RNA sequence: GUCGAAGGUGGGACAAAUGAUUGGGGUGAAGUCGUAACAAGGUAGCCGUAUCGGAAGGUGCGGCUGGAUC
RNA sequence: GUAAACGAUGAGUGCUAAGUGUUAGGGGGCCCCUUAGUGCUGCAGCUAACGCAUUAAGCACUCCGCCUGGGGAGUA
RNA sequence: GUACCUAAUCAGAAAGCCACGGCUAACUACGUGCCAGCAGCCGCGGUAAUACGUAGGUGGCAAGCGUUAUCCGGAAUUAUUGGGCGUAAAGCGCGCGUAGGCGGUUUUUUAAGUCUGAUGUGAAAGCCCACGGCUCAACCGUGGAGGGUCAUUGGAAACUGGA
RNA sequence: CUGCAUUAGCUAGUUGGUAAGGUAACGGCUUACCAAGGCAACGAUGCAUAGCCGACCUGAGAGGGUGAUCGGCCACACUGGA
């Protein structure tokens, strides 16, 4: 499992004397073969806040049907007021995505595709509304077998 | 050979004496947002007889320059 | 809105602002009106010269002239690098670009351009400030 | 050639040696400057995705505009954009005549070739941006078919890619078919060239 | 007042899909049934029954789930509407889910999906998509 | 002789510039007077209206909770 | 001719778990069902959250009114 | 007597511009000390400044490199595609109502909208695709392709419209 | 095929007819007589701005912006009339 530290952020609780600061990391945990999942980890140092956030997305992972190194077709993701488009595209075209959509993207192991954020740019909205499209994206057998056709069927 | 412009619209006046003013609508589509809306285009067309009236379905027919601005030939009564 | 809405009201973008207004703006004599022409610098006639100081927190005298443009128009422009040989009557080229620290001021008097003179012993960025290559 | 600064510096920088013998990466392979040695930050994905076409480029001894260029009809190709790109800079007059190992280094070819003892066809080409393509012959100009340097780097028997077919004793080369990115080489990730000039 | 029965049916359908139901009762029409009929034979609804009451009629769905209580039926979505009225020509009939899913399409040969008005060659007004 | 450019005369319309003086607006500092609001802000606040007062505001009538300890 | 004229929530229509009070009726055996209101609690769904939730702020279609950073200013 | 070709001589005549705090590729030293100054925005400068000035080094380009002005983009920030209106800006205080918009089920019919052919036309040049010619490229030429809400004419009848 | 309603009324050769003249040519194009018509919230009138187009820039597209060079069309030649 690859992993990338997507932000790193220094949150502050305010106390009677001064203030208590933490490091919070998001981190996104992907095997680059259709599996991906995103974690959070808060903790006094950076090291140890990405090791608890490596551990929270290992365990949290989800399954991206693909097409030859892209998705089986146009979704778009809603989590909040995080939104992201994606589109299958060819071969060559690579990943054209930008921020934690990049990263969840390579980590699942697409590698042709074209995104937009059209919502929220805060990391983690836009990280969750990436997986909510990964996870509402079909794939043409499963589809098949839903309806209860066989794959020719389905496309006549 | 060549034939003329016709066009089938009701008369909305005949107060001028053998002019009758023809009303023929067409529906143009918005450009950007696609809707169909009505559009009225009002046609002074020329009558000899004062044989159309206020009302009548009539078809005319395009023609030379008959007047300051009429450009039509009533042809038929099609309803009344 | 509806679609009918929208066909009864088109939508209407909003209206963008030039942030030079006096580089927009020419000056026919003969006729004695303004006309709408870009210009990317226009030439002036120091009315003022001298220092300001920034709004806060910055503190400096920032130095400045009062000049009047071409096209009859009296603008603020700040004068950038260290050391100028600007007085009142000089004639000076302006540029765009306003300077954040000071209120009124919204132009830049091009370095090594008609009176003003280059930057003095500036040897990085020279081309910024009008200064000769030293060699 | 056009850029004439420390190509070891620059294969220091970039990690990779564009000569191809890795005499600049045996020694110190850290970046040049004065924070060359205890470098230890890390590249952001810009920063990758700029040294990965900074190293084709500079492998490849072209200026920032032709490359955007070639790389621009590479995209008005069909097939892999990347893989276009790649075997588009192979195809290069520069590129086939150090294939073929008519001299020893890139530049010391674009040298040969700019001041003209290479022939395509047997008509004269001055300019290395030229590009081959399958069916031609590379040859050299007759009152250079003895000079030292070529000579010297004909004797040291280099490996010939699969795509080109060359006589030494003729010292004439042949560009058969299309390279392929096997054959072309793979310390390039195209991708990321892909998606620097995408943004 | 009722403006679009062809969305009210469908939103009944995705109504009654979203809360798992098993049977829709909703009223009849032509159109409502070659939708129904169309959606049978797609897969997306297990059956279609008609009732010829006295009024307009009814027409019962029975909805269509898979393993896992998976639904079959993704979305339902209204393209034409009283409002605005979406036409296409055979060329440019639209691939729902690039493929996935069906475009229901009313043509001069009848009421057909997205795949049938491309094998003849056809346009009309696209009354909806289902996926 | 008709028509007829320019010109002359007259009362209007519209637009721009300028004008003693004047109104409020913004900006600027470490100015002067008070302390109206935010906590029950020390008379809960706010909305419309009337009136009054250096000023914030006060008071009356109706309305709201976006207030209410025990 | 204006109010914090407020549920700070336009009108019409249909569809989508339930529990419980109350007002005016209706049908069937103190109980069950039902129509129209008026409250409280509560799923799915929705929401930035708070919360809404068959009296929606859910799912849909029609029409209307309205918004596009703050101030200047509801001023000239 | 221009291009071009042939023969001889010399690395000898021919490198500058901006940037290096984040965005954004590139950091050290010295001087200055809320001054001098920088700045596209967040801001940087009050004595050990990767942000000011110089130096070394580094990065991006290169006969150009920067600045300014203007347009489109990023901006889904006028949202048809593709946004909203309880508290963030936004439901008229509320009725009665005209125009307009929209409109329940079935059958027959029409063919204005809709869909599908044919014909004419949408100059040349230009964008795009292919080929050919200048040593390559820009450039030039040739042939395709496309561009109409276009016009006449023949077909289809589910839907919207008329009867 | 453009902006403005903080521009809502405009028009009297004006709208139609008869006759005559006039022009390459039809025609209120002009002139006599008869009638009161004609345009306009589907934006008339007024005010402001503007040569139009093939195209050009930009954008994934939908769209937005522009109208140098080159080609087509229109208009003008110190200002106004003949
Ligand atoms: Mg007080
Ligand atoms: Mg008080
Ligand atoms: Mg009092
Ligand atoms: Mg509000
Ligand atoms: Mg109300
Ligand atoms: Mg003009």
Redesign the pocket.
């Known amino acids: 499992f690859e992993e990338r530290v997507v932000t790193i952020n220094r949150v502050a609780k305010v106390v009677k004397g001064g203030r208590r600061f933490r490091f919070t990391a998001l981190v996104v945990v992907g095997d680059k073969n259709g599996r991906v999942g995103f974690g959070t980890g808060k903790a006094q140092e950076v090291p140890e806040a990405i090791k608890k956030a490596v551990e929270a997305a290992k365990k949290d992972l989800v399954v991206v049907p693909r097409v030859e190194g892209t998705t089986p077709h146009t979704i ?1 993701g ?1 989590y ?2 995080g ?1 992201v ?1 994606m589109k299958p595209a060819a071969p060559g075209t690579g990943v054209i995505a930008g921020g934690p959509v990049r990263a969840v993207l390579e980590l699942a192991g697409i590698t042709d595709i ?1 995104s ?4 929220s740019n805060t990391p983690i909205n836009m990280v969750r509304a990436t997986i909510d499209g990964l996870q509402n994206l079909k794939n043409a057998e499963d589809v098949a077998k839903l309806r209860g056709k066989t794959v020719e069927e389905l496309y006549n | 050979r060549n ?1 003329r ?1 016709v066009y089938v619209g009701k008369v909305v ?7 009758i ?1 023809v009303l023929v ?5 918005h ?12 046609y ?1 067309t ?1 009558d ?1 007889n004062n044989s159309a009236k206020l009302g009548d379905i009539v078809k005319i027919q395009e023609t ?7 450009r039509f030939r009533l042809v038929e009564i099609v309803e009344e | ?14 209206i ?1 602002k ?4 006096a ?2 703006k020419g000056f026919n004599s003969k006729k004695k009106k303004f006309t ?1 022409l ?4 226009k030439r002036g006639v120091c009315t003022r010269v001298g ?1 300001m ?11 400045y002239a009062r000049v009047r443009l071409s096209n009859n128009i009296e603008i603020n422009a ?7 040989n600007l007085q009142e009557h000089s004639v000076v080229l302006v ?9 009124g001021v919204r132009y ?1 008097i ?1 370095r090594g351009a008609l009176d003003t003179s280059g ?1 003095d ?9 009008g200064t000769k ?1 030293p060699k | 050639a ?5 190509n070891w ?2 294969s220091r ?1 970039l990690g990779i040696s564009l000569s191809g013998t890795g005499k600049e990466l045996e020694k110190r392979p850290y ?6 040695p ?2 230890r ?1 890390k ?5 990758l995705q ?2 990965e ?2 190293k084709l ?1 500079y492998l490849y001894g072209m ?7 070639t790389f621009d009809i590479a995209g ?3 097939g892999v954009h990347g893989e276009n790109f790649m075997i588009l800079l192979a195809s290069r007059l520069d590129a086939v005549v150090y294939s073929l190992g008519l001299a020893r280094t890139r530049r010391q070819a674009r ?1 040969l070739v700019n ?2 003892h290479i022939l ?1 066809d047997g ?5 290395p ?3 081959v393509k399958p069916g031609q012959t590379i040859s050299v ?1 007759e ?1 250079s078919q003895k000079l030292n340097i070529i000579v010297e780097s004909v004797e040291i028997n280099n490996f010939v890619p699969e795509y080109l077919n060359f006589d030494a004793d003729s010292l004439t080369g042949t560009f058969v078919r299309l390279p392929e990115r096997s054959e072309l080489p793979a310390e390039i990730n195209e991708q990321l060239i892909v998606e620097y000039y995408s943004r | ?5 062809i ?2 049916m ?3 359908v ?3 899909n ?2 798992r ?1 098993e049977k ?1 009762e ?9 939708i129904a009929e169309i959606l049978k034979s797609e897969g997306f609804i297990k059956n279609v029954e008609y009732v010829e009451d006295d ?3 009814v027409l019962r769905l029975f909805l269509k789930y898979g393993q896992n209580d998976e639904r079959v039926i993704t ?1 339902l ?2 393209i ?6 979406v ?6 009939m639209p691939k729902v889910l690039n493929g996935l899913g069906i475009a229901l399409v ?6 057909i999906t997205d795949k049938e008005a491309r094998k003849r ?5 696209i ?1 909806a998509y289902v996926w």
């Open positions: 778009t809603r909040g007021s939104s488009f074209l937009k954020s059209l919502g | 034939d412009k006046s005949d107060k001028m004496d053998k002019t003013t609508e067409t529906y143009k589509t450009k950007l947002y696609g809707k169909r809306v009505k559009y009225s285009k009002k002074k020329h000899e030379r320059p008959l007047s300051a601005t009429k | 809105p509806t679609i009918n809405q929208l066909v009864r009201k088109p939508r209407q973008s909003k963008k030039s942030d030079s207004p580089l927009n709408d870009n210009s990317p610098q220092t100081t920034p709004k806060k927190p910055n503190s400096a005298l920032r130095k700040y004068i950038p690098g260290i050391g100028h540029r765009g670009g306003r300077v954040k620290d000071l209120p830049h091009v930057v012993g500036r040897r990085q960025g020279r081309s910024l400030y290559k | 056009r850029f004439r600064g420390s510096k620059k920088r970046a040049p400057g004065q924070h060359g205890n470098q930050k590249l952001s994905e810009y920063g700029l040294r076409k900074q480029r200026t920032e505009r032709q490359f955007r260029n008005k190709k069909f040298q001041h003209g395509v008509k004269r080409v001055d300019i941006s030229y590009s100009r009152k | 007042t009722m403006t679009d029965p969305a009210d469908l939103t009944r995705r109504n009654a979203m809360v139901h829709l909703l009223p009849a029409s032509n159109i409502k049934k070659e009024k307009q009629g979305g979505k209204r034409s509407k009283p409002g605005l009225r036409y296409a020509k055979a060329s440019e009313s043509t001069s040969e009848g009421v060659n056809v346009g009309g007004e009354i």
